[PDB]
Amino acid sequence: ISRKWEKKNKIVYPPQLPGEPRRPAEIYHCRRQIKYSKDKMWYLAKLIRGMSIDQALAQLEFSDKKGAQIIKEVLLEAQDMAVRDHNVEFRSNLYVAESTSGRGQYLKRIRYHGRGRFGIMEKVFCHYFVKLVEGPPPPREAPKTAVAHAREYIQELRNRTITHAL
Amino acid sequence: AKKGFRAAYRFQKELERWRLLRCPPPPVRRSEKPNWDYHAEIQAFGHRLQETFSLDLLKTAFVNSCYIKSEEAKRQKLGIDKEAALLNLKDNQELSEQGISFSQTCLTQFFEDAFPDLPTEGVTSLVDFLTSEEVVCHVARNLAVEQLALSAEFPVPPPVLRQTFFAVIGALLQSSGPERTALFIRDFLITQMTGKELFEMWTITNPMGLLVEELKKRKISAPESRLTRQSGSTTALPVYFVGLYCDRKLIAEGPGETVLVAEEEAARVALRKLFGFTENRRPWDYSKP
Amino acid sequence: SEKEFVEHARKAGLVIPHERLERPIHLACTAGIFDAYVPPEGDARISSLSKEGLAQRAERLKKNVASQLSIRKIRESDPNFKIKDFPEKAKDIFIEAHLCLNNSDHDRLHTLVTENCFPDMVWDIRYKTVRWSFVESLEPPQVVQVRCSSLMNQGNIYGQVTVRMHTRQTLAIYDRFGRLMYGQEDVPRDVLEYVVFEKHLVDPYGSWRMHGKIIPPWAPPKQPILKTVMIPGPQLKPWEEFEEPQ
Amino acid sequence: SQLSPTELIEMQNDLFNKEKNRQLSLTPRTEKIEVKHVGKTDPGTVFVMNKNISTPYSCAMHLSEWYCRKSILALVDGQPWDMYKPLTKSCEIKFLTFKDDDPGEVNKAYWRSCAMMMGCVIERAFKDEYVVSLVRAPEVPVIAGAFCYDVVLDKRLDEWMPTKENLHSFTKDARALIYKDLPFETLEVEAKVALEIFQHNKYKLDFIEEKASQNPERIVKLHRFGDFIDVSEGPLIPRTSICFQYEVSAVHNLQTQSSLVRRFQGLSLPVHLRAHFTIWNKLLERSRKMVTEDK
Amino acid sequence: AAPKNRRSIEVNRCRRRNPQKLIKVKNNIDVCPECGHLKQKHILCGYCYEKVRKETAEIRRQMGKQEGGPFRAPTTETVVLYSGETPSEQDQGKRIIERERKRPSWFTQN
Amino acid sequence: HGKSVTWWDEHLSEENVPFVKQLVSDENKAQLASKLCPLKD
Amino acid sequence: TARGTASRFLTSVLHNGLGRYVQQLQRLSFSLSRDAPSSRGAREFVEREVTDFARRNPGVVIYVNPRPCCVPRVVAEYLNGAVREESIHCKSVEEIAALVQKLADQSGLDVIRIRKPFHTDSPSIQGQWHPFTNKPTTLGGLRPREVQ
Amino acid sequence: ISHGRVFRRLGLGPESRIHLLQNLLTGLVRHERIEASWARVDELRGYAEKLIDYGKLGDTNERAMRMADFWLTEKDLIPKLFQVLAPRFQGQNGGYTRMLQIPNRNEQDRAKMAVIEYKGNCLPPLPLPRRDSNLTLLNQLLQGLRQDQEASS
Numbered sequence A: 001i002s003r004k005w006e007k008k009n010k011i012v013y014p015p016q017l018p019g020e021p022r023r024p025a026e027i028y029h030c031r032r033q034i035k036y037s038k039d040k041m042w043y044l045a046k047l048i049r050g051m052s053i054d055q056a057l058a059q060l061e062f063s064d065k066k067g068a069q070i071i072k073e074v075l076l077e078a079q080d081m082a083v084r085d086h087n088v089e090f091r092s093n094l095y096v097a098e099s100t101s102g103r104g105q106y107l108k109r110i111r112y113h114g115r116g117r118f119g120i121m122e123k124v125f126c127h128y129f130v131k132l133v134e135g136p137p138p139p140r141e142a143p144k145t146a147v148a149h150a151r152e153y154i155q156e157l158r159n160r161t162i163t164h165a166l
Numbered sequence B: 001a002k003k004g005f006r007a008a009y010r011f012q013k014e015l016e017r018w019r020l021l022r023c024p025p026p027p028v029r030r031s032e033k034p035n036w037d038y039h040a041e042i043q044a045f046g047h048r049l050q051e052t053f054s055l056d057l058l059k060t061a062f063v064n065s066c067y068i069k070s071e072e073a074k075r076q077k078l079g080i081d082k083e084a085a086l087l088n089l090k091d092n093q094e095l096s097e098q099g100i101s102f103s104q105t106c107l108t109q110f111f112e113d114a115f116p117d118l119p120t121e122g123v124t125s126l127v128d129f130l131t132s133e134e135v136v137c138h139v140a141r142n143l144a145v146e147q148l149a150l151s152a153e154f155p156v157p158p159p160v161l162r163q164t165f166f167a168v169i170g171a172l173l174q175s176s177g178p179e180r181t182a183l184f185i186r187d188f189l190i191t192q193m194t195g196k197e198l199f200e201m202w203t204i205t206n207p208m209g210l211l212v213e214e215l216k217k218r219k220i221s222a223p224e225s226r227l228t229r230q231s232g233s234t235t236a237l238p239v240y241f242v243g244l245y246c247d248r249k250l251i252a253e254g255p256g257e258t259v260l261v262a263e264e265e266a267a268r269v270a271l272r273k274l275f276g277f278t279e280n281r282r283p284w285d286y287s288k289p
Numbered sequence C: 001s002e003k004e005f006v007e008h009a010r011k012a013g014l015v016i017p018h019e020r021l022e023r024p025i026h027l028a029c030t031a032g033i034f035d036a037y038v039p040p041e042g043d044a045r046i047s048s049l050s051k052e053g054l055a056q057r058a059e060r061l062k063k064n065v066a067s068q069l070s071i072r073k074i075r076e077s078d079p080n081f082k083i084k085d086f087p088e089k090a091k092d093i094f095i096e097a098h099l100c101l102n103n104s105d106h107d108r109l110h111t112l113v114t115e116n117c118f119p120d121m122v123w124d125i126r127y128k129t130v131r132w133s134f135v136e137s138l139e140p141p142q143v144v145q146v147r148c149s150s151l152m153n154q155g156n157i158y159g160q161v162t163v164r165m166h167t168r169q170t171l172a173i174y175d176r177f178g179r180l181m182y183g184q185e186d187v188p189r190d191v192l193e194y195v196v197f198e199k200h201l202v203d204p205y206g207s208w209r210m211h212g213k214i215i216p217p218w219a220p221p222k223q224p225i226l227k228t229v230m231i232p233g234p235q236l237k238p239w240e241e242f243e244e245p246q
Numbered sequence D: 001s002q003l004s005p006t007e008l009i010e011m012q013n014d015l016f017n018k019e020k021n022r023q024l025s026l027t028p029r030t031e032k033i034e035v036k037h038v039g040k041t042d043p044g045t046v047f048v049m050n051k052n053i054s055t056p057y058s059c060a061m062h063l064s065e066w067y068c069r070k071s072i073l074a075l076v077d078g079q080p081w082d083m084y085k086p087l088t089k090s091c092e093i094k095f096l097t098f099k100d101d102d103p104g105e106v107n108k109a110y111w112r113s114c115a116m117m118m119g120c121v122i123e124r125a126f127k128d129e130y131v132v133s134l135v136r137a138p139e140v141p142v143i144a145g146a147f148c149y150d151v152v153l154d155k156r157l158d159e160w161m162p163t164k165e166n167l168h169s170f171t172k173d174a175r176a177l178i179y180k181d182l183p184f185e186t187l188e189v190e191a192k193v194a195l196e197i198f199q200h201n202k203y204k205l206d207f208i209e210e211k212a213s214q215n216p217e218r219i220v221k222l223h224r225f226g227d228f229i230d231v232s233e234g235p236l237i238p239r240t241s242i243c244f245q246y247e248v249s250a251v252h253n254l255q256t257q258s259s260l261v262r263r264f265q266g267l268s269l270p271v272h273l274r275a276h277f278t279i280w281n282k283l284l285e286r287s288r289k290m291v292t293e294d295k
Numbered sequence E: 001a002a003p004k005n006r007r008s009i010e011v012n013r014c015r016r017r018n019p020q021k022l023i024k025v026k027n028n029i030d031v032c033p034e035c036g037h038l039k040q041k042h043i044l045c046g047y048c049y050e051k052v053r054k055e056t057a058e059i060r061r062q063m064g065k066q067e068g069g070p071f072r073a074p075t076t077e078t079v080v081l082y083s084g085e086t087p088s089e090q091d092q093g094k095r096i097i098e099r100e101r102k103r104p105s106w107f108t109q110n
Numbered sequence F: 001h002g003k004s005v006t007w008w009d010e011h012l013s014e015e016n017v018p019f020v021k022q023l024v025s026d027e028n029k030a031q032l033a034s035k036l037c038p039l040k041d
Numbered sequence G: 001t002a003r004g005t006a007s008r009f010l011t012s013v014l015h016n017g018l019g020r021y022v023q024q025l026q027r028l029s030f031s032l033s034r035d036a037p038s039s040r041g042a043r044e045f046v047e048r049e050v051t052d053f054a055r056r057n058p059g060v061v062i063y064v065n066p067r068p069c070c071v072p073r074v075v076a077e078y079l080n081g082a083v084r085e086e087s088i089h090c091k092s093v094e095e096i097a098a099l100v101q102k103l104a105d106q107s108g109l110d111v112i113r114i115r116k117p118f119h120t121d122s123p124s125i126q127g128q129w130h131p132f133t134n135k136p137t138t139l140g141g142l143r144p145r146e147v148q
Numbered sequence H: 001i002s003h004g005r006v007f008r009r010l011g012l013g014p015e016s017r018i019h020l021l022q023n024l025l026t027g028l029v030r031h032e033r034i035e036a037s038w039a040r041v042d043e044l045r046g047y048a049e050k051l052i053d054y055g056k057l058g059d060t061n062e063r064a065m066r067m068a069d070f071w072l073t074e075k076d077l078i079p080k081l082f083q084v085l086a087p088r089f090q091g092q093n094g095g096y097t098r099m100l101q102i103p104n105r106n107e108q109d110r111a112k113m114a115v116i117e118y119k120g121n122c123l124p125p126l127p128l129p130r131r132d133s134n135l136t137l138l139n140q141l142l143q144g145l146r147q148d149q150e151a152s153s
């Protein structure tokens, strides 16, 4: 197996010089060996990507997925760790930067079908990784406007050159 | 267990390469690198330029005030006496100032004899562009002046690089002849202007105003902007050609996306034609008089 | 198909294996402090005068019979024991321990401080940056009392010496992200503590190790935290009604 | 005086910043205050805050983002309190939203904020060669359909009245101001510095004098968002973006023996309490009428 | 029918990352004005409903303890009172349940 | 700004809903009655 | 493969050869061994030809390092700051001399595909073609179906 | 094609649906408030409304008596139905039951659940969704509109 998301939270940064901007706090957390399915957990992880912690918790509260409760517990534990261990005030000033789901060690069993035939059934386990960054959530990216499209098209036309000319 | 050492050593080399890619180390000094010999480097730098410098002058020019201050701080921190030799390093401030002055004067004279029609502001802008931080630092880095410059902060900021380069220039002026120094300046700074445009380094604001002032100086009444050719007016990308007529005589023409841009380009073309800095001008003469 | 998971981490301790240990656990120091010295509340005002503090500190060390008998027992157990030469050694040990904690030199910190002192000074600080310095000493450290505990079951005598220390220290504790957390590095704030050192007399080596750090109950409160702290209330079950205390 | 409007704005902002710096330097250290939460949701909550630095907005952030999104006003143990005004001593805080049982204080705060925003739009939507002087914000009750602001215009501007196009331009300017989030800051100053802060509007000087007369300590409450500074009673909303619907209903020229004043009446609804299109049209039609309530 | 060729990862992603299969964000989430917990606008509050359910379960447990049989149901109205309360004139003549707990704030006398 | 969905009945009070219904009904009745004579306008 | 590898245009460092030619090879460091049989060619080259090459080209700093190594190597560092490392493992003296001459003649630039075999600055002498450079102008500049 | 259909399919058929509705109605009568699936509660609302109307017809009505005998499986509830619910529902015309959707069940099925309650029961009031007070901004503006309308007449 591999365990690096847990150790990523043990890194120590050098003291900031007087005048440098305050570096936002980053907290890494992970839940290992969850009975939930990898893709089903990935759907929930993608649901709360880039959102605020409170809004993610609110969505997970009313989400009917089984892993919604697990992710809510993970977020609560991560917030508690950020408040207690790390020097992070304003516990509601955290946003989910990354939220990923991977697979783990599966279990192999026999699933009978009939006529003496059987298949391999995989009891699946998933790992959930979450990263919380202190600060307001980043704004969503708006679709490219017509003026920006025109600027890009004009730039592409102007960047042309006579190929195979000299 | 595969019995072998070549594969293990090759994989260790691969791991070192991967580590280097993952975390790039900070740049280190060429002198601090193992293969280094300062006297041999100085001699090679002198010989590679087809020049005859003085070793003492080069050593004087290649030291810096920041380096001297760092050495003095180390001396004070260590508690050893270095006032006998460290204080006699003979900082290159005088050499750098002499190099700056001589280079500016020589470039001004070169541009005046090459383009008599260039105004004082134009020639000053050209000299400042040639002596600017970017060009001088690029030349010094390509000539490995940065590696031979004794200074802390191995990045060697642009002011330090320019100071070292002009100190080397002043040392060359003191060692060899002024004509040889002028030839070196021509070969290593004017060549950076090859293929460049006058306005790219002049950065004027009112081409039309400058053109009308130049025409007034040259005893020309006024330029008239007339639309010569165009391609599309209601299209998303119109193209216009504006020409300048003095006494109903076309002096220059310029294309543009809009009429104002075309007129500005025509004024720029007329100004370049009047000053002689044209794409069809005489190439710079690189010979031995 | 018949495969199961393994490696279930559990911590279950039983009295039988603890009592069936072939070798007893070797302890270099005691658990805590047996006799805690209670300082008078007027020490803060007494410290304003030099002789009015020094004479009292000298008189109290001599008038106590327990301290004198403890010093006599220490001297008879180990020769070349001088009370007058002790405060300088204690001050140097404290300064070097603070420097080692600043430098994260755990080996030297273990050599200096004892096993009852190391965790209390390493636990909450192992993941933070410390910038501590020594600038001045307003009052020289003063030996207040000396205590000794003798356990006859193993024939072990542990001697602890209490020294009042009034120091001028500058402390700056940073965060793991590099931001300042506790205090500034240029303020020479004054502190007054009581360091209790422990030394095993039976041991032939017997290094002096700092054991306890006593603060007076009337000591001024510590400097405020730079951040803001929210204290949650009691979590209430749906069937439980809240009670507001008055 | 030969002063450009931008120069006046710069001078007012600089003086306000100097007063704020003096207020901040008044406290040399960071004192810890224990603030209780007396709200119905989470009783017994304790906040360890910095004196004259922490804010009820920071307390709401400590609680949860829902409090920041919903709660507009703070009741510090005896009185309303805006979110961006630093706390002074240990106390208890209760948060107040739009949909509370007795939201009247929040309604007054929103009314005053809308009046101040309309005055800010009016003062800068007029030509530089003309003179525009804001008088005050008459506190009319929530029963009245529009918030009113008093403006004295140039003498040659007393003939014409703004048309539908002008009202729509004012509404567009107000919406543009809303689009950019400008927090409301409350600063406790004295009449001695308020006089030099304003120094140009005689009506504003008279308002400052009459507001300082009733205060024995000569304390004047100033509010500033962006580059606009005005004096008003009570706290204000923390954020401008709370105002979602905003319209400049009409103007009514009231003529007195000394001068004639344009009373601009406008209508606004917050994001939490936005209404339907027909309801908004009916409310605007009601607000078109004259509102007269000064004492 | 059997598949003809293995579906590539790009096709799989384009199939199972479409917004139709993605979980939509619900904008009806609100906080309960009473207890401050989360609830939907068209659904009752879970916390308050749990409190009411607990109280009702206790009341029904006591009223079933009062009736020793399964088919012994009251033929008249029933009234529940808490400690420190007495039946009024309009509450008299009905079956009476008495609780040791005090009257909750949400529960009105009426 | 994660604004929630709002309908016309969410923010109204008990006494106001009948008032709104009446203010819509009579307005619609007046609008319909106004156009009842198109040939004379 | 052009699509697989990188590419660059035909360029010269610091416009070399315009005013004067500068040898782009700055330093040349040989690392060899005295007892390894593979270092025979490097040892013989150091014995014979390194002094003549140094005399012919004084602008390059030549370093020689015998060390307990198995792979004899040559590191050339150019004025561009580029470092090119080659192996002289089991090569004859003629091959070593040819490699050294090739390194000296190289400009130190990246050995990748050159898009064009030519590089001319401002090739628009006497003008550059535009769709209006061959179309005669009508009287008054009128459009084909525009009436004045 | 399910056009013009008012009865939804439940259980193992029509008789199974009738029996399930009868059991739910018996439980509702016995406990004065029950919780079940949202569809089941919605279906049972009509039968609960009809049962009160049948009980209001009188104790001596043989049709109502046999209807109660069929529906109320527990015969101890029939006297309760005819002597408690019917007497207390006299002036009320159709406001006999209240139905509210509760959050989904904590079981893995996550079914949509509702709760039905007979009005005037001896149970703690449910957290009914209360309208905003008239002191709100929009409510006060509507009050001003109402006052203006009243003054105009």
Ligand SMILES: [Mg+2]
Pocket (backbone or CB within 6 Å): A116
């Ligand atoms: Mg079988």
Ligand SMILES: [Mg+2]
Pocket (backbone or CB within 6 Å): none
């Ligand atoms: Mg398979």
Ligand SMILES: [Mg+2]
Pocket (backbone or CB within 6 Å): A120, A122
């Ligand atoms: Mg499979």
Ligand SMILES: [Zn+2]
Pocket (backbone or CB within 6 Å): E032, E033, E034, E035, E036, E037, E045, E046, E047, E048
């Ligand atoms: Zn609730």
